[PDB]
Amino acid sequence: VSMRDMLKAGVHFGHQTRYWNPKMKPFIFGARNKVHIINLEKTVPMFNEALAELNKIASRKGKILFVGTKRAASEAVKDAALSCDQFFVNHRWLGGMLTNWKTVRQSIKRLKDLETQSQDGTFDKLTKKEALMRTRELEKLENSLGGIKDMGGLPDALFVIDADHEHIAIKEANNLGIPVFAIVDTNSDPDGVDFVIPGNDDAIRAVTLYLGAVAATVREGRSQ
Amino acid sequence: SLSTEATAKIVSEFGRDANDTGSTEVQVALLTAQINHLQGHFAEHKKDHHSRRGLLRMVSQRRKLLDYLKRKDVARYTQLIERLGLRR
Amino acid sequence: SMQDPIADMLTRIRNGQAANKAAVTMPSSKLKVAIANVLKEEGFIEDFKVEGDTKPELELTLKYFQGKAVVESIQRVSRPGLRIYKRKDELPKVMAGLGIAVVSTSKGVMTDRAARQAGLGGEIICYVA
RNA sequence: GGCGUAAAGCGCACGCAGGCGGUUUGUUAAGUCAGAUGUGAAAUCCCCGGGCUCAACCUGGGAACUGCAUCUGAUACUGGCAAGCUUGAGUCUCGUAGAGGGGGGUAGAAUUCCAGGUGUAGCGGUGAAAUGCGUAGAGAUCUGGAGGAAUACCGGUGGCGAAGGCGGCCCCCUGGACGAAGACUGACGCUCAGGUGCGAAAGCGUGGGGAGCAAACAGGAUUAGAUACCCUGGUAGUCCACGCCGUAAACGAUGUCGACUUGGAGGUUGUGCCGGCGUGGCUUCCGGAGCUAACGCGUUAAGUCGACCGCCUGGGGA
């Protein structure tokens, strides 16, 4: 990754000067049409060192959680984690997925038995009506836990999209000292993230750019 | 207020050039002239309290300037209050 | 009106450290320069400098070690409303010794340590920690 | 230790005494600091020992007696003195906005009354009524006049003023605030007990005025009762001039002044540059750190400091 691709994909394209966060004055050069421009020289080294940390944590067989819920990137993030051998959460986050893992573990156990009931012929011995509720449980729990069914232990690091949108997940991960990575707009906060990476995450191009670069570095780290 | 010509006249008569307005002598002369003018205004307008407050402000500012001059130079203070008939 | 420039300087230092300001620029005085000397020679701030002939300006570069501010508690002790003087026998110890009490003595503005070693009392300018 | 809401910021201001005081140099050494000398009685207290078989107790020596005076030094800070400096404060030039104040005049809308024209059995009021007004002609409607008070729209959590407060329009007299460039003085400052002044409405004194409104009062209702609520009237008073009173939930329940400390959504008035880029003031709302008991405050602080003032110390009594 480098400055030219970031400017091509609108990484510098942040939010309005009215939505600017008080804590992101350094990460911005100036203004144009009342839209703040995320500094692109401050982005490359910080993004690259966050990528290098992701690569290093990929050597220790360390798990990574990809977090992003908005509809613009749901398929993009759900693929960027599916082709990374790492778990994700891309739909409506259940608060307490990390701090209260001792109940959603029972939830995913019920989900696993209900989804082995999918390939079991179970939805044939019931009177064509309970199958509706079981299939709806399948649907809702797959939406809620679409990547962490085989998670098998709290994730080691948290790579997130739109840090402000996922502040519940961010603060949960902070509550246990888990390294947290944020694709964070100017309108969002760096206080809950130990690795702040200023960069747009509404531009689907920028989301794909960050996801692809981090996938490349994490796959490189996990190769060895 | 004092007309522009009156202000210029007092500054020239009390300043040590055509452009010396901030000196204590010029300031006290201006304050005294304004008070002497305002006495006639408040003879007719004993109920003009809002302007009398500003007149008393001028009085107090002049008193402080005279006290400052007196501790600064007795000779200029005596000359100044002689040139005006100021009681003290 | 402005009546305690020394406490004003301590307040500017404290506010900058609470605001995470990099440096603070203020009108310069010889006593302010002396307290900045004492603070720099004890590591509480990074460095100082002065700009200006008729109106010198004192700019102190603050330091922060682990994100957090270096100076924890900096407090005016002897004030215009109440001047505080100590003989060498009864000089204070800030933080049981970990901080300093900036004591102007007859041999210059120094810490409580240097004043105690030199066998001198003096006015207790400020506590730093 | 406190003072937004628990008790607590004087209603506001000016100001003497007092308290405090931007920056530079020299000097002094008063405060400050060092050392000494003298004194600080003994005892007591404390420490190290001694004697009563121990202890209490007695006892040797020391320390302490935190103080005062004198002397000799030191000069960083405060003070005195002398000279500077301009950034606090202030004066001058031009310009800006304003219901800032005093006095005088004028205008239109509306109410009441008086006169008249047209016209006839109602009007008015209420939850429903009645009191009341009207056949002596009301109400309605049209015209003329008298008079008093208040100034629709504009009008804006707009503006100005220390606060109280200030609202049609014009004029005369007049206070303050602010801004752009400069010019000038050179700490002349801040706060302020006592003191002085101002200070809503009601009220008081003297003399005017009196439309509307309306304490008191009267009547009609309501009601168990109704010295009220509602209705019909209606006098002080509200208006004016002068004097007095000196109090309001006189409130931001938040003293003044100065310095410093993330942001954002709106409105307002100057000045620079080509509707945009700035620069000074003000104002409304949310909100971060911080603070708070919380509510909340939050660059217009209730955050971090400094100067000074005022005030509080359980409830009642009071």
Side-chain angles (χ1 to χ4, degrees):
Chain A
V1 79
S2 204
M3 26 201 96
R4 191 254 145 180
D5 75 69
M6 300 175 168
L7 74 89
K8 173 225 288 214
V11 165
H12 72 114
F13 265 115
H15 292 202
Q16 334 195 348
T17 169
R18 64 148 69 187
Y19 288 104
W20 93 313
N21 188 284
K23 296 167 192 165
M24 275 45 186
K25 188 163 119 182
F27 298 128
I28 290 176
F29 181 65
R32 185 231 57 102
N33 257 25
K34 284 137 199 61
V35 191
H36 265 113
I37 301 273
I38 327 193
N39 206 267
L40 276 178
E41 291 180 55
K42 285 296 301 201
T43 308
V44 168
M46 280 226 60
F47 194 20
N48 258 292
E49 58 149 338
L51 283 141
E53 174 48 50
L54 288 183
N55 179 271
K56 160 156 301 305
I57 201 50
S59 82
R60 290 107 157 263
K61 333 292 207 307
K63 304 166 238 200
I64 274 171
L65 192 54
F66 294 91
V67 220
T69 67
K70 291 183 272 84
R71 291 96 155 288
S74 310
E75 73 284 323
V77 186
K78 97 164 311 303
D79 268 2
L82 264 177
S83 76
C84 199
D85 280 351
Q86 303 294 332
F87 322 103
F88 62 82
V89 171
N90 75 308
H91 293 283
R92 286 323 296 122
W93 172 282
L94 305 187
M97 170 191 328
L98 321 165
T99 25
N100 193 30
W101 183 239
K102 288 86 37 193
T103 301
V104 277
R105 190 197 335 164
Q106 313 158 48
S107 152
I108 75 174
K109 188 234 171 269
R110 159 62 174 191
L111 173 52
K112 274 176 151 7
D113 298 29
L114 186 275
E115 98 161 346
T116 58
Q117 275 173 355
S118 100
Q119 310 300 331
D120 194 88
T122 295
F123 298 20
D124 295 61
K125 299 92 191 191
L126 259 29
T127 26
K128 195 244 176 314
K129 282 239 82 179
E130 261 198 308
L132 261 49
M133 326 310 157
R134 297 202 170 280
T135 332
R136 211 144 191 79
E137 193 157 282
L138 189 143
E139 278 279 354
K140 64 167 284 143
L141 285 204
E142 221 66 24
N143 291 324
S144 65
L145 302 129
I148 65 169
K149 59 217 306 308
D150 322 320
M151 144 200 183
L154 293 171
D156 274 305
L158 266 292
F159 190 76
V160 201
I161 307 276
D162 210 335
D164 247 14
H165 208 103
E166 314 284 297
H167 49 272
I168 291 179
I170 292 200
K171 71 154 59 173
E172 282 197 52
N174 308 145
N175 212 284
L176 300 157
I178 285 164
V180 165
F181 289 68
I183 300 313
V184 49
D185 288 280
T186 54
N187 79 331
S188 172
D189 262 337
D191 232 350
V193 196
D194 211 10
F195 290 82
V196 190
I197 305 114
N200 188 291
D201 45 66
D202 301 19
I204 183 57
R205 214 134 49 245
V207 193
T208 59
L209 207 151
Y210 310 133
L211 280 168
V214 302
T217 205
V218 172
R219 223 151 63 212
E220 282 313 318
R222 265 165 93 77
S223 272
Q224 141 90 46
Chain B
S1 280
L2 230 50
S3 91
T4 305
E5 310 338 306
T7 307
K9 242 179 84 175
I10 285 135
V11 164
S12 314
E13 185 191 346
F14 276 73
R16 40 174 219 195
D17 52 295
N19 304 324
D20 178 36
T21 59
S23 76
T24 315
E25 269 54 88
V26 167
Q27 287 197 49
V28 165
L30 286 172
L31 295 155
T32 293
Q34 189 59 34
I35 292 170
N36 302 347
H37 183 102
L38 270 177
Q39 298 295 333
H41 170 94
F42 290 103
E44 184 152 74
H45 288 293
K46 323 230 262 193
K47 267 36 184 325
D48 201 3
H49 295 293
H50 288 62
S51 316
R52 162 156 278 108
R53 207 177 93 106
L55 160 68
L56 293 175
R57 214 277 291 289
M58 302 176 219
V59 160
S60 268
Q61 207 237 51
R62 181 178 81 188
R63 170 82 261 110
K64 281 167 175 146
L65 287 179
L66 274 307
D67 269 32
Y68 166 65
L69 204 74
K70 185 192 178 94
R71 40 181 300 295
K72 160 138 284 178
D73 207 328
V74 166
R76 276 185 334 200
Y77 159 77
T78 40
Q79 248 63 53
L80 177 49
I81 89 173
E82 153 100 11
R83 290 197 54 181
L84 294 191
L86 299 168
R87 340 185 181 150
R88 58 171 309 309
Chain C
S1 71
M2 159 62 43
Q3 290 180 61
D4 202 357
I6 285 79
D8 173 44
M9 156 258 276
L10 313 174
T11 286
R12 280 188 195 219
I13 278 165
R14 189 196 301 111
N15 282 354
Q17 297 253 267
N20 289 126
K21 295 288 313 298
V24 287
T25 324
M26 86 216 294
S28 195
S29 78
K30 108 159 100 193
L31 192 63
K32 271 187 210 184
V33 168
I35 325 289
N37 220 278
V38 185
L39 285 182
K40 176 198 113 174
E41 91 200 8
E42 214 92 26
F44 273 118
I45 49 72
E46 165 73 78
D47 185 29
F48 73 99
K49 48 171 314 183
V50 187
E51 256 273 22
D53 174 317
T54 299
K55 58 173 329 167
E57 274 271 292
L58 181 66
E59 213 227 67
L60 312 183
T61 299
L62 309 185
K63 52 178 287 194
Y64 313 78
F65 176 30
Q66 293 159 23
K68 316 210 324 222
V70 162
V71 184
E72 161 215 354
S73 81
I74 179 182
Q75 141 186 9
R76 182 74 141 123
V77 182
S78 140
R79 43 196 194 90
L82 187 47
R83 306 283 188 182
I84 299 288
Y85 304 107
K86 296 299 164 180
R87 321 222 302 142
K88 47 95 143 188
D89 196 6
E90 280 314 89
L91 279 176
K93 268 149 166 144
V94 172
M95 200 96 108
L98 304 193
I100 66 170
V102 179
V103 176
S104 181
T105 87
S106 178
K107 280 70 181 43
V109 177
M110 77 201 53
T111 65
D112 57 315
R113 190 265 279 136
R116 222 167 319 213
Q117 272 158 359
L120 297 159
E123 165 159 3
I124 313 269
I125 308 201
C126 63
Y127 294 165
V128 193

